[PDB]
Structure 1
Amino acid sequence: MKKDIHPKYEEITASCSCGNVMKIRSTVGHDLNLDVCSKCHPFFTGKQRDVATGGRVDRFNKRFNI
């Protein structure tokens, strides 16, 4: 490129708390250990939990213990 006007680029290997470790090229300087990556973030199971609202007569029905 422009011959040393750009930041450093090193093949680091970033790690995750739930596995998910890969060989990456980035300008960081230390392999940061982050939380769930794309392989574990709940956008495949959490879709069920995405519709978290529903049921008000349910609330009425549960209060009716009489």
Structure 2
Amino acid sequence: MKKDIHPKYEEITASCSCGNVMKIRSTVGHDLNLDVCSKCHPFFTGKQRDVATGGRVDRFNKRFNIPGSK
């Protein structure tokens, strides 16, 4: 639902089996928190994988320079 940094998903989809199943799939992503910002001190954003992998190449600031303003 969150994964703040990056969008998320929670988008539906039909899960077929052997030929077809008109069922439905959905809930995905992950979660975690407590990210120590070198600045003042850590707020616990609820990002997930890909979201957490993002704060890597990026910063920890820029990655928050958005969740903040905007």
**TM, length-normalised to structure 1:** 0.17
Inter-CA distance 14–35: structure 2 relative to 1 (3 Å threshold): farther
Count the aligned residue pairs. Answer: 66
Higher relative contact order (CA 8 A, sep 6+): 2
Q: What runs of 5+ residues in structure 2 fail to find an aligned partner?
A: none
Give identity over the alignment, percent. 100
Q: Pick the structure with greater CA Rg.
A: 1
User: Greater helix percent: which structure?
Assistant: 1
TM score, norm. by length of structure 2: 0.17
Between structures 1 and 2, the one with greater strand share: 1
Identify if the C-alpha distance between structure 1 residues 33 and 21 changes in structure 2 by more than 3 Å, giving closer, same or farther.
farther
**Are 1:14 and 1:33, in contact at CA under 8 Å, matched by a contact in 2?**
no
RMSD: 20.4
